[PDB]
Design a protein around this ligand. Structure first.
Ligand code: ADP
Ligand code: ADP
Lengths: 235, 120, 238, 120
């Protein structure tokens, strides 16, 4: 119940999420190997790049598992600097563009203040918080809609910087809102069954945010969309 | 000139299966989800359907069920190509009318043997 | 408190999945990128060899994902057993062949004796008993002595107590006494200076015990540190 | 040519790293574990050592420590190429005298830049 039922679900979900890139790896490798007379040079190269890009996705999924274990062990440390958040967000936005296009999701960025927005943070780790939020914005986007988006909004509030990740996705039921930040927790519904994941992303993101002295909360309505709020002190 | 309807939500996956079917001289029509697949049966009858299970909008179990509910659709052989590993998943798909269930990750040459066998 | 009952072991388990999968993935990615960047400097022979490594490393990664799957299926009780009349002798030989390359990469000789003439028929699930034997043969390789010229893993077949008795014997590192009670528990791995580099999740023997008990049999172990181990698997004839 | 001692317990990994080093004109000497590596330093002095951490018999942290304990061996540059991702693992290796730590999975072309930078 506690975690045990969720642990068995978690274990099955690692299997499922990794099996997808691995399927592409193996099919594309075997195809090159058995079809060398039947590939032109554009195609050979494209098939190699699939292998490489799918390895990359699998690698990201392993790094999630690692980072989580490192957090459950208070070993994950943070190193703050002075970063232009406008630049950090625009870089994160670029990193997800291909994944968002594959799901027909437009990815937007607005700053409510003028840029730059220097702030004292670990840039790797906040890039990782943003990528988890941007990825979820894509993963949990509406199934068939012509205007799907994920928007990053930057502002300066209560001393700190407020980062909102807004979507017009499936949204999150009331009962679930309390629990989404829990390790292994995933909403199970007819709108999430095909979507891969472990339930670790938001537990990791919550821990990184808290290590910076900030907090993260959510506002959602089912069928409309969700807003994830990340407040981190400026310094 | 055998025609295959290939149904899967992964563009990456469709690309590789399609490559392999075209090496044999088959034509390929692609659908991104179960509903789109049933919509394309409005314009042709395939000689074979290659079907995934876990798709948005309409899953493969619902596709297989709806394929038995229409006279014109029920005799088109279906190979299910899925990451669902369980014996129960396979049994359900076979009970829903699939001719063959193949697990992912898959061998492309084994998959093509099974395709050939159902086509002949 | 047995908070860590699973909790400390769970964190460890998570970190171990990451490590074990990272190894084949590193090869996949390094070999794919090298092919991509070296189309001009690769001869055909080397191209094909590098593609086969990608395919074989994918296959090892797939095996490890099927362990996580099967463990979740045995927790949920959905894993079923389908028996047949199988020649165990031939089933063992097939297992031994499946592990030959991996054993050879660690300089471990893999042997098979039958104490009874052969065939040795038994009414069992062939796939599931193959998977029991592969987990025991893999462990005999993984936990083999680090630097020894006569490393082996040996499968011994007998017919005992109205059943088949399969013994998997090795001359590896052996298992300490406190650890012996616990090695069949999910997530449990002996942690010592002789196991630190050895990849794994601690699920293999939990899976094997569950499969064996679904067949109405039992599995137990005998070991001495520094000498080696014997795993005993008893399954009813019919 | 420059000479590289390549230390890792995976033959599959030594193979791909060696392929990429010999593309640059380097000579390569392989060792399957830390103790074998230190044995081969009695028959030569490499310009660079590529070192894994998790090996049987002697691990790479013990290798790095012994490298500093011998006058002849202490100034050979070492790149650590490892699956150990922690900041703490990297810090320990640099404190043991590693010049650079690279994570696994790695990019063979980024690896080769770092090798060249250290050799020149
Ligand atoms: N933007 C969103 N819209 C709707 N649901 C969301 C969104 N982001 C997160 N979720 C829900 O919160 C759960 C936990 O998310 P996360 O911890 O990132 O894990 P995962 O994405 O692997 O399931 C998800 O399974 C999903 O139910
Ligand atoms: N043949 C053996 N010799 C020594 N130790 C063994 C052997 N087989 C299993 N073990 C020990 O039992 C533990 C559990 O084994 P297993 O459940 O197969 O998981 P893993 O092999 O992933 O750790 C291993 O970590 C190891 O300490």
């Amino acid at each position: 119940k506690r975690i045990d039922r969720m642990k068995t679900e978690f274990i099955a979900n690692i299997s499922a999420e990794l099996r997808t890139p691995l399927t592409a790896i193996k099919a594309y490798a075997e195809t090159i190997y058995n079809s060398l007379g039947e590939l032109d040079l554009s195609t050979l190269k494209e098939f190699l790049e699939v292998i490489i890009d799918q390895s990359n996705h699998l690698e990201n999924l392993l790094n999630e598992l690692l980072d989580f274990s490192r957090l459950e062990r208070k070993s994950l440390q943070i190193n703050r600097e002075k970063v232009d958040l406008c630049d950090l967000v625009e870089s994160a936005v670029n990193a997800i563009k291909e994944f968002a296009s594959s799901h027909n999701v437009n990815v937007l960025f607005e700053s409510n203040v003028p840029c730059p927005v220097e702030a004292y943070i670990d840039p790797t780790r906040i890039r990782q918080v943003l990528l988890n939020l941007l990825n979820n914005g894509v993963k949990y986007s509406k199934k068939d809609a012509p205007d799907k988006y994920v928007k990053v909004i930057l502002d300066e509030k209560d001393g700190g910087v407020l980062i909102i990740v807004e979507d017009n996705g499936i949204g999150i039921p009331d009962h679930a809102k309390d629990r989404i930040f829990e390790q292994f927790y995933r909403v199970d519904s007819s709108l999430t069954y095909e979507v891969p994941g472990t339930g670790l992303g938001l537990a990791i993101t919550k821990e990184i945010v808290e290590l910076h002295g900030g907090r993260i909360w959510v506002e959602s309505e089912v069928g409309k969309g969700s807003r994830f709020f990340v407040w981190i002190p400026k310094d | 000139s055998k025609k295959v309807l290939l149904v899967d939500d992964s563009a990456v996956l469709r690309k590789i299966v399609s490559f392999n079917l075209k090496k044999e001289g088959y034509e390929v029509i692609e659908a991104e989800n179960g509903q789109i697949a049933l919509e394309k049966l409005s314009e042709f009858t395939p000689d074979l359907i290659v079907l995934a299970i876990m798709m948005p909008v309409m899953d493969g179990f619902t596709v297989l069920k709806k394929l038995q509910e229409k006279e014109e659709w029920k005799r088109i052989p279906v190979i299910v190509l899925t990451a669902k590993g369980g014996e129960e998943d396979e049994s359900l798909a076979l009970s829903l009318g699939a001719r063959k269930v193949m697990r992912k990750p898959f061998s492309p040459s084994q998959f093509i043997e099974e395709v050939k066998h159902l086509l002949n």
